[PDB]
Write a protein that binds this ligand. Structure first.
Ligand SMILES: CS(=O)(=O)Cc1nc2ccccc2[nH]1
Length: 119
């Protein structure tokens, strides 16, 4: 029932994600010199350094907000991919499975702690 525990749990999950070779394309904002049409396709770019910085700045109120930004990294990858077989898209699918597997308990514990707080 610790309402704040999600933050360190998210920091540790982001550390695991940065160690994972599948996060390489997503560790920093997309470079427009490499992908000049990126903003024609993607409304809201997102990457793991921006997620980490937002968390460390105290700019996420809940793990649901962090989850929404991480899911945006994966939906941007799916929207930009030229094919379902691309290297970077295949990396985002594995990384998404890894993220969803680990964020589930974080979200559950936070929501349970908040329901207890407001009982
Ligand atoms: C900096 S990035 O994340 O590699 C930009 C991007 N996102 C993609 C998704 C699929 C294929 C190529 C893609 N290039």
């Amino acid at each position: 029932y610790d309402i704040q525990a999600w933050k360190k749990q998210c920091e540790e999950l982001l550390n695991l994600i940065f160690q994972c070779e599948d996060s390489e394309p997503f560790r920093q904002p997309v470079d427009l010199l490499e992908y000049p049409d990126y903003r024609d396709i993607i409304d809201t770019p997102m990457d793991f350094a921006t997620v980490r910085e937002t968390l460390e700045a105290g700019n996420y109120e809940s793990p649901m907000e962090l989850c929404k930004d991480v899911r945006l990294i994966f939906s941007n990858s799916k929207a930009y991919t030229p094919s379902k077989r691309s290297r970077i898209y295949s990396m985002s699918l594995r990384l998404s499975a890894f993220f969803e597997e680990h964020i589930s308990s974080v979200l559950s514990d936070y929501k349970s702690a908040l329901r207890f707080h407001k009982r």
